[PDB]
Amino acid sequence: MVVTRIAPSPTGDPHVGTAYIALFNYAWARRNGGRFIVRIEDTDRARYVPGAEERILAALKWLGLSYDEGPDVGGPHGPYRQSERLPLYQKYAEELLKRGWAYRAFETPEELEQIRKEKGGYDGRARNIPPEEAEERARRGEPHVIRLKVPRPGTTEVKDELRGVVVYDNQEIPDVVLLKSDGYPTYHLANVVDDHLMGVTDVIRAEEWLVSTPIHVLLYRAFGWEAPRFYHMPLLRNPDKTKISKRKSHTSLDWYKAEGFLPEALRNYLCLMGFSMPDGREIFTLEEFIQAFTWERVSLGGPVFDLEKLRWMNGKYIREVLSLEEVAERVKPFLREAGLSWESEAYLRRAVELMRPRFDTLKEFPEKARYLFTEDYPVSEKAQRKLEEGLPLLKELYPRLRAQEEWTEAALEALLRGFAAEKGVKLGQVAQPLRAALTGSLETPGLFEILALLGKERALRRLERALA
Ligand SMILES: Nc1ncnc2c1ncn2[C@@H]1O[C@H](COP(=O)(O)OP(=O)(O)OP(=O)(O)O)[C@@H](O)[C@H]1O
Ligand SMILES: [Mg+2]
Q: What SS3 string covers the chain?
A: CCEEEECCCCCCCCEHHHHHHHHHHHHHHHHCCCEEEECECCCCCCCCCCCHHHHHHHHHHHCCCCCCEECCCECCCCCCEHHHCHHHHHHHHHHHHHHCCEEEECCCHHHHHHHHHHHCCCCCHHHHCCHHHHHHHHHCCCCCEEEECCCCCCEEEEEECCCEEEEEEHHHCCCCEEECCCCCECHHHHHHHHHHHCCCCEEEEEHHHHHHHHHHHHHHHHHCCCCCEEEEECCCECCCCCECCCCCCCCEHHHHHHCCCCHHHHHHHHHCCCCCCCCCCCCCCHHHHHHHCCHHHCCCCCCECCHHHHHHHHHHHHHHHCCHHHHHHHHHHHHHHCCCCCCCHHHHHHHHHHHHHHCCCCCHHHHHCHHHCCCCCCCCHHHHHHHHHHHHHHHHHHHHHHCCCCCCHHHHHHHHHHHHHHHCCCHHHHHHHHHHHHHCCCCCCCHHHHHHHCCHHHHHHHHHHHHC
Give 268's contacts (C-beta < 8 A, 6+ positions apart): 282, 283, 284, 285, 289, 313, 317
Nearest to 233 by CA among 20, 466, 461: 20
Beta-sheet pairing, 145-148 with 177-179: antiparallel
Specify whether 218 is located in the same domain as 318.
Answer: no
Of the candidates 3, 4, 71, the residue with the CA atom closest to the CA atom of residue 39: 71
Catalytically active residues, by annotation: 246
CATH number at residue 13: 3.40.50.620
Residue 48's Cβ-side half-sphere holds a number of Cα atoms within 13 Å equal to 11
> Does 15 sit in the ligand 1 pocket, CB within 6 Å?
yes
Q: Distance from the CA of 237 to the center of ligand 1, in angstroms?
A: 11
As beta bridge partners, residue 179 has: 146, 185
Asked whether residue 6 falls in the same domain as residue 17, the answer is yes
Please count the CA atoms within 13 angstroms of the CA of 34 that sit on its side-chain side: 20
CA of 56 to the centre of ligand 1 (A): 14
Residue 426's domain is classified under what CATH number?
1.10.10.350
Work out the burial of residue 427: count CB atoms within 10 Å of its CB; fewer than 13 is exposed, 13-18 middle, 19 or more buried: middle
Q: Which of 208, 233, 299 to mutate to test the pocket of ligand 1 (most atoms within 8 A of CB)?
A: 208
Going by DSSP bridges, is the β-strand pair 3-6/35-38 parallel, antiparallel, or unpaired?
A: parallel
The radius of gyration computed from the CA coordinates of the chain, to the nearest angstrom, equals 31
246 lines ligand 1 (CB under 6 A): yes
Q: Is the CB of 235 under 6 A from ligand 1?
A: yes
Q: Closest Cα to atom 9, ligand 1: which residue?
A: 17
In this structure, the residue with its CA closest to atom 12 of ligand 1 is: 17
**Amino acid found at 433:** P
Cα separation, 412 vs 418, whole angstroms: 10
Q: Among 246, 253, 304, say which to mutate for ligand 1: greatest number of ligand atoms within 8 Å of CB.
A: 246
| Closest ligand to Cα 22 | 1
90 with 159, same domain? yes
Q: Which CATH number goes with the domain that contains 161?
A: 3.90.800.10
Distance 229 CA to ligand 2 centre (A): 23
Q: Does the annotation flag 173 for ligand binding?
A: no
Q: For ligand 1, atom 29, which residue shows the shortest CA distance?
A: 18
Q: Which ligand is nearest to the CA of 235?
A: 1
Same domain, 56 and 83: no
Q: Looking at the structure, do residues 382 and 467 belong to the same domain, yes or no?
A: yes
End-to-end Cα, the chain, rounded Å: 75
**247 vs 59, 119, 251, 369, CA distance in Å?**
20, 33, 9, 33
Contact (CB, 8 A) for 343 and 404: no
Task: Check the CA dihedral 293-295-297-300 and report its sign.
Answer: positive
Co-location of 76 and 108 in the same domain: yes
Judge if 60 and 154 occupy the same domain: no
Ligand that lies nearest to the alpha carbon of residue 7, given by its number in the listed order: 1
The residues pairing with 278 across neighbouring beta strands, listed in sequence order, are none
Residue 427 assigned to a binding site:
no
Tell the residue nearest (CA) to atom 21 of ligand 1.
Answer: 245
Question: Does the beta carbon of 273 lie inside 6 Å of ligand 1?
Answer: no
Q: At 332, which CATH number?
A: 1.10.8.70
Residues in Cβ contact with 431 at an 8 Å cutoff, skipping those fewer than 6 apart = 416, 447
Question: Residue 375 sits in which domain range?
Answer: 371-468
Give yes or no: residues 52 and 100 share one domain: no
Name, in order, each residue with C-beta under 8 angstroms of 103's C-beta and a sequence gap of 6 or more.
97, 126, 127, 129, 131, 134, 146, 147, 149, 175
Is 161 among the annotated ligand-binding positions?
no
Cis omega before residue 87 (within 30°)? no
Burial profile 121-157: b = 16 or more Cβ within 10 angstroms, e = fewer: ebebebbeeeeeebeeeeeeeeebbbbbbbeeeeebe
245 in ligand 1 pocket by Cβ < 6 Å?
yes
Do 317 and 355 share a domain, yes or no? no
Closest-CA residue to 37 (of 70, 60, 63, 15): 70
Mutational pocket test of ligand 1: of 6, 15, 209, the residue with most ligand atoms within 8 Å of the beta carbon = 15
Starting at the edge strand found earlier in the chain, the sheet holding 177-179 runs: 102-105, 145-148, 177-179
Ligand 1 atom closest to 8 (CA): 29
Same domain, yes or no, for 80 and 174? yes
Burial (0-12, 13-18, 19+ Cβ within 10 Å), 233 = buried
Q: Do 28 and 43 fall within a single domain?
A: yes
237's CB contacts (< 8 A; 6+ apart) are: 243, 244, 302, 303, 304, 305
Q: Is the CB of 236 under 6 A from ligand 1?
A: yes
Domains held by the chain: number: 5
* Site to substitute for ligand 1 among 231, 245, 304, most atoms within 8 A of C-beta: 245
Q: By the 8 A CB rule, do 163 and 232 touch?
A: yes
Same domain, 295 and 337: no
Closest ligand, as measured to the CA of 245: 1
CATH number of the domain where residue 301 is located: 1.10.1160.10
Pick the residue whose CA is nearest to atom 7 on ligand 1: 17
The residue among 23, 53, 69, 11 whose CA lies nearest residue 287 is 23
* Residues 377/450, Cβ–Cβ less than 8 Å: no
Q: Is 208 annotated as a binding residue?
A: yes
Which residues on adjacent β-strands are paired with residue 237? 243, 304
Nearest CA to ligand 1 atom 22: 245
Ligand 1 atom at minimum distance from 245 CA: 21
Q: Is the dihedral of CA 43, 44, 49, 55 positive or negative?
A: negative
17 Cα: distance to centroid of ligand 1 (angstroms): 6
| Neighbour-count burial of 343, counting CB atoms closer than 10 A to its CB (0-12 exposed, 13-18 middle, 19+ buried) | exposed
